[PDB]
User: Fold Capsid fiber protein from Bacillus phage phi29.
Amino acid sequence: RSKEISIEVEDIKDAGDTGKRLLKINTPSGARNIIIENEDAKALINGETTNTNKKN
Amino acid sequence: YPLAAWQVIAGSDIKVGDNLTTGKDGTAVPTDDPSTVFGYAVEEAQEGQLVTLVIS
Assistant:
């Protein structure tokens, strides 16, 4: 009868929507895409800014 | 012959109702960490004594 019963993210009944997205994410870039909504701030944190991002 | 209970040598002091897991050298020891639990004692045993446990 198995040994571990590896649950999945959606089995965690009091996890939040952003919380489940973060738990599923594999890389730091993916996490930043979830967490940072302001596109100019995200661009700064990614070290990749256009002239429009810089002005903003 | 699917047994509901086993007779296993105790690796340490086991009390009645204690959840058991593997210890060193195949002996049975008390545990407080679910997933390591394979059964529980219905008998009390010192150390090196056999203890009856119900598998769960």
